[PDB]
Structure formats: C-alpha cells, structure tokens
Design a protein around this ligand. Structure first.
Ligand SMILES: *C(=O)[C@H]([C@@H](C)O)[C@H]1CC(SCCNC=N)=C(C(=O)O)N1
Length: 252
C-alpha cells in the first residue's frame, strides 16, 4: 500500500558472501539466500532481486501453522479437520486432513479455516514481532495469496531463522510439530525441511518459492529460493534449491 511495501532495505549487519548461481537458474529469474548458523553468515545470489518483496503464497502456511499451534486451534494430540464436502480438482484435498497431510499437499482450505479463527490484532502483533515483510494485512482475507502481504527472499530466511532459533513466545513443542510437518527428506547426512509456494495470475505462474532449512551433523542452514520469471513455479524453485544446496556441500 505504501512506498516501502515492495522492498526490504534494512542493511545486513552480518558477514555475507555473494554467489553466482546463474547457470542453475538458467532461463528463470530470481534469487537464492542461505544462512549458516555456525558461520552466522549469509550467502546470496542476486542481492538486489532478493530484497524485492513478493506475495508469500503457500509459504505463509508455515506461519499459519505456527499461529494455529500457538492459539491451540490445532495441537499435538489432534490436528485433524474434516473436509466440508466441497469438491476440489485435486483428490488429496477432498478428504480429512491433519497438519502433516495439509502441509505436504498444500491444502488451502485447511489453512484458510485456521486463518479465519485468528483475530486481526493477533496477526498484526505477530507480523510486527517477527518482522514479516511489509506486514500489510489489507482486507484480512486470503491476504497471503497474491494480495497485500509481501515479503522478500532475503526476509524469508531472516524471519524463519529468528522465529525458530530465538527463545520467543512460541513453544518448543509447537516448533517441533511444525518441523515434523515440513520434513521432506532425511538420510545419514541431512534432514531437509521446507515448503513450496506458487502464485498463479490469469493462468500463468507468476511467483515461485521454496523456503526451508537443512540440518546436517555439522551445521543448520536456513534457505530460500524465489522465482519471479521464466517458469516461476514452487516445484521449479524446489529443484533449483536442491541443485544449489548440493553444489554448496550442504547435502552431504
Ligand atoms: C500455494 O502456493 C498455492 C496457493 C493456492 O496459495 C497452493 C497450490 C500448491 S500445490 C498442491 C497441488 N495439489 C496437491 N494435491 C501450492 C504450492 O505449494 O506450490 N500451494
């Protein structure tokens, strides 16, 4: 809504390293950001582009999950929600869900039902304390879907790292339940957690994301890929992320 709503301009006070991942991006346009806990350092491809703010789309379901956990809308014994019988074009949505199935299959209605229960002032207080992008709730509806709420690729990393790693008002059991819902891959070398996001405008992919973290035996890394052009899907942002993480030594 304002002059600072499309841009993150706050100086990075940390050590940073500029990357060149242009061959992995190919004909897609966007940015990649990673933070290493042990190094306390950022690694950024396309720094200017990493500070442009975009709708988070389904990546904001990380925060809706944390809010629903925090407000006891869902819990550890029961995160189940029945389907309202409305037919969706993907059968994974046309059934009962829990936090794990809804996160994995990005089931909008589950997180919409969570959001509808959450008072605007709580969200405002949370987005302020978390420093979540432009903090702009607009109409307070599906505000995170190609709407007023926007966040930069650089901020996706800072905000998620700070939420998970600081002793804040979110409980340890909530953070662990959210993590369990985000786990994608675990082997002898790493655990990989994350969440895709895709914005679709007039039939075309507009906006792709993959935001997450990696735990190895040595370090913990938070990362985010944003795609703004080319074939900017969540699936593509996930693939590009995996290729970059592997090149960097994060996945072994
Ligand atoms: C999130 O980015 C979108 C959006 C509607 O907010 C939804 C659609 C999908 S993918 C799930 C497809 N069907 C599965 N059974 C995503 C996405 O994460 O990219 N989320």
């Amino acid at each position: 809504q304002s002059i600072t709503d499309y841009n993150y301009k706050k100086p990075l006070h940390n050590d940073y390293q500029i990357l060149d991942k242009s061959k992995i991006f190919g004909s897609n346009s966007g940015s990649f950001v990673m933070y290493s806990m042990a190094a306390d350092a950022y690694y950024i491809y396309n720094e200017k582009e990493s500070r442009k703010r975009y709708s988070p789309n389904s990546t904001y379901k990380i925060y809706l999950a944390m809010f629903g956990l925090d407000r006891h809308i869902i819990n550890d014994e029961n995160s189940r929600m029945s389907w309202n019988h409305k037919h969706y074009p993907f059968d994974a949505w046309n059934k009962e869900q829990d936090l794990n199935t809804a996160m994995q299959n990005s089931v909008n209605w589950y997180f919409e039902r969570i959001s509808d229960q959450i008072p605007k002032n709580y969200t405002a207080t949370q987005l302020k304390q978390l420093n979540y992008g432009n903090k702009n709730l607009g109409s307070y509806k599906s505000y995170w879907m190609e709407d007023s709420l926007k966040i930069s690729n650089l901020e996706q990393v800072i905000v998620f790292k700070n939420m998970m790693e600081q002793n804040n008002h979110f409980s340890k059991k909530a953070k662990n339940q959210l993590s369990s819902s985000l786990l994608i891959k675990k082997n002898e070398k790493y655990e990989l957690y994350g969440k895709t996001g895709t914005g679709i405008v007039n039939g075309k992919y507009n906006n792709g994301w993959f935001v997450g973290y990696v735990i190895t035996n040595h370090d913990k890394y938070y990362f985010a890929t944003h795609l703004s052009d080319g074939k900017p899907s969540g699936k593509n942002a996930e693939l590009i992320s995996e290729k970059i993480l592997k090149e960097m030594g994060v996945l072994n």
